[model samples]
Target: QDLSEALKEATKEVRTQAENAEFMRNFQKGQVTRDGFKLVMASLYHIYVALEEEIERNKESPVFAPVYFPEELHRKAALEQDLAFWYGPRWQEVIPYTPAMQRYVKRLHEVGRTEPELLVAHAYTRYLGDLSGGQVLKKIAQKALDLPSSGEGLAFFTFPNIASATKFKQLYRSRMNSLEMTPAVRQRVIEEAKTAFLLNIQLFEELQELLTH
Candidate 1:
């Protein structure tokens, strides 16, 4: 099987767990509050910062070169814009960086530094998921939070360079399948995808706890 197929099969269960996490369930139902949305965006800001930094570090490497599309897939800048909208001019000082998010960042750096080939798993799990289900999330967030129609705080979900999310995702999956990997490494990549899902689940669970308590 191609690496993409392998990852899909391997991460199926954990992916479901991530979707079922209370935070995400609430989000899907448009039960989100402004504060909850802001916190989630802040955590995402830290996440994309680490992930994109690692992508830059490995962009020239053989392991990451096949799937490097910085202009089309990068989210740090978008997150920055969104944070500025939500947190005001001093968003940097006021944003919360929780323990769960810290752990996710630590693991991303570790993968980027020591096992660069595995970085695609992280990229695949996040970027692909974003392009797919994240569109629905954008609408839900917009309506739930009563955000501006001009897309002020929703930049993170908008891929301005990619004209069509569907076509872009097809190309992304093709790129993922093109990367060369041994059976062992492919298995590891799939495992890493599951790890990525679990990290997201944990982050969501923590966010739900913080919102409730």
Candidate 2:
């Protein structure tokens, strides 16, 4: 698949799932509450936009390599650690947290008028994470890095520790690098990413539109 094709392959699922797209995941049980859990979904959209830009920059340079991997592991790790530390700040316990969280939740609930499944998938992971020590991630965050509990806060990484998660990730990574560039497929990749961007714009606008509507 070309870049665009790869993006469309991924995006196709969302448009199908949009009406059911519940993209919210609660933060730390209630510390960072969202009415319907849209913050996480919105965050993901923002993160992906950043990713798309980075991908585009890569395509235009000598750094243009297949698979566009994230190296600088230490630097990346440090930044990740900083984010973790920021999320765990004691300042979040303040009452101001509640207002923001409640508003976020309400916004999410409103935006999620249709896409329930996407939210379910997001919450499903959080549910699993909260239940089973977050399927190992909670334990690691708590013990290895002094991160808080999934029950306490930090809902973003609350991924499902299902048996197939590794397999699924491997499959995705494989797909990312698998586009054998026949001229046709290469052009296909570009088209796919463009479609992806369009779908994402729609998704973001859908969510943003709710704030107005």
Candidate 3:
């Protein structure tokens, strides 16, 4: 099977668990509050910072070059715009960085610096999932939070370079499949994808707890 197919099958179980996470379930139900949404965006800000930093570090590497599309997929800039809208002029100093987010950030750096080849797993898990479910979440958040129709705080979900999400995703999978990985490395990448999902699930569970109390 292609690496894309292998990754899909490997992460299926954890992916389902991530979707069923309490935070996500509530989010999908449009039960998110302004505070909750802000917290998520803040956490995402930290995450994308690390992920994109790593992507930049390894963009020219053989392992990551195949899928390098910064203009099309980067989220750091969009997250910055959204954060500024939600948290005011001092957004950078005010946003909360939770323990869970720190852990995820740390792992992303570890992957990027020590094992750049495995960066694809983290990228695949985040960017692909974002392209798929992020649209629905964007609308749900807008309506639930009563955000402006002008898209002030929703920049994270907008992909201006890509005209079609479906076609872009197809192109991404093809790029992923084009990557050359030995059997052992391919297996490790698949396992890393599962680890990425678990990290996200853990982050959600912790965020839900933090919000409740």
Clashes of 2: 20
Poorest lDDT segment (10 consecutive residues) of candidate 3:
142-151
- Candidate 3 residue lDDT tens string, 1-213: 988898998899999999899999999899999988999999989999999999999999999999999999999999999999999989999999999999999999999999999999999999989878878998898789987666599888888888999999899999999999888898889999999999999999998999897
Please list the residue runs of candidate 2 whose C-alpha ends up more than 4 Å from where it truly belongs after superposition: 1-153, 158-178
lDDT of 2 by residue, 93-199 (tens): 42122233334344334323332212222222222223343445444444433434444434444432334555544543454445344566444444433343344
lDDT for model 1 comes to 0.91
Question: TM-scores across all candidates?
Answer: 0.97, 0.28, 0.97
Per TM-score, what order, best first?
3, 1, 2
Better of 2 and 3 by lDDT: 3
After superposition, the stretches of candidate 3 with alpha carbons farther than 4 Å from their true spots are 148-151
Q: lDDT score of model 3?
A: 0.93
Model 1, 152-204: lDDT tens per residue? 88888888888998889888889899998888888889889999999999999
Model 2 C-alpha lDDT versus the unseen true structure: 0.36
lDDT of 1 at 37: 95
Error at 16, model 2, angstroms = 25
